[PDB]
């Protein structure tokens, strides 16, 4: 057997023609781009989302200038955080919870607080408890 294929029909594994080492062939990383802005009347800063990618290769290829598209004036500011949606780059991770304003995915939303664009986990609502009092209404 020379090479392998996946559950689809493109080859992802090969026995090496020179030294017979059994290899894997994953394709190169790719995906979509979002832009998270609070409004031109609000501000003039944005923070971009790069979809379905690993932050190891994305944060590398920015500094090494390997992205098509490439921007004229842009830098990360060293804010790279991995969601399951992808590497949110340009916003500030905050450890609190709020209500969702601009969605991202996997329970992460982003908005414009003190100003700068911040990212967090959603709060499902107000927290409360009700007593099960055996004789009370």
Partner 1 sequence: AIPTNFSISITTEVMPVSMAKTSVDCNMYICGDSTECANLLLQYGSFCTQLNRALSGIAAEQDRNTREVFAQVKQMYKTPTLKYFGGFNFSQILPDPLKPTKRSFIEDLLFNKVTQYGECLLICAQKFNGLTVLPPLLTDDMIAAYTAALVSGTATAGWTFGAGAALQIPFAMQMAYRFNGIGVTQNVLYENQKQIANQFNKAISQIQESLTTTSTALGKLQDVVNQNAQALNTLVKQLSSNFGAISSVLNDILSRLDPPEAEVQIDRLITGRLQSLQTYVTQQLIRAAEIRASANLAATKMSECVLGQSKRVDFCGKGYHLMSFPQAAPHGVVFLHVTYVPSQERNFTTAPAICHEGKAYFPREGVFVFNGTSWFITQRNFFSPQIITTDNTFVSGNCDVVIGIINNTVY
Ligand X SMILES: *[C@@H]1O[C@H](CO)[C@@H](O[C@@H]2O[C@H](CO)[C@@H](O[C@@H]3O[C@H](CO)[C@@H](O)[C@H](O[C@H]4O[C@H](CO)[C@@H](O)[C@H](O)[C@@H]4O)[C@@H]3O)[C@H](O)[C@H]2NC(C)=O)[C@H](O)[C@H]1NC(C)=O
Ligand Y SMILES: *[C@@H]1O[C@H](CO)[C@@H](O)[C@H](O)[C@H]1NC(C)=O
Which chain residues interact with partner 1 by CB under 8 A?
6-10, 12, 26-32, 51-54, 82, 84-86, 100, 103, 105-107, 122, 124-137
Stretch that binds ligand Y, among 27-35, 76-84, 119-127, 129-137 (CB under 6 A): 129-137
- Neighbour tally for 40: CB within 10 Å: 7
Unique residue bearing structure tokens 């969605």: 103
- DSSP, collapsed to helix, strand or coil, labels residue 15 as strand
Which of 23, 29, 42, 70 is the binder for ligand Y (CB under 6 A)? Answer: 42
d(CA 71, CA 61): 13
Structure tokens at 21: 């080492």
Which residues sit at the interface with ligand X, rule CB under 6 A? 54, 56
Which residues sit at the interface with ligand Y, rule CB under 6 A? 18-19, 41-42, 131, 133-134, 136
């Amino acid at each position: 057997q020379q090479f392998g294929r996946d559950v689809s029909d493109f080859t992802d594994s090969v026995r090496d023609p020179k030294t017979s080492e059994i290899l894997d062939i994953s394709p190169c990383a790719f995906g979509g781009v979002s832009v998270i802005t609070p409004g031109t009347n609000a501000s003039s800063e944005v923070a971009v989302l790069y979809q379905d990618v690993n932050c190891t290769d994305v944060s590398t290829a920015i500094h090494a200038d390997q992205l098509t598209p490439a921007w004229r004036i842009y830098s990360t500011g060293n804010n790279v955080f991995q969601t399951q949606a992808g590497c949110l780059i340009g916003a500030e991770h905050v450890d609190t919870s709020y209500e969702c304003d601009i969605p991202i995915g996997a329970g992460i939303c982003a908005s414009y607080h003190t100003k700068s664009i911040v990212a967090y986990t959603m709060s499902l609502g107000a927290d409360s408890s009700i007593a099960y009092s055996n004789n009370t209404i």
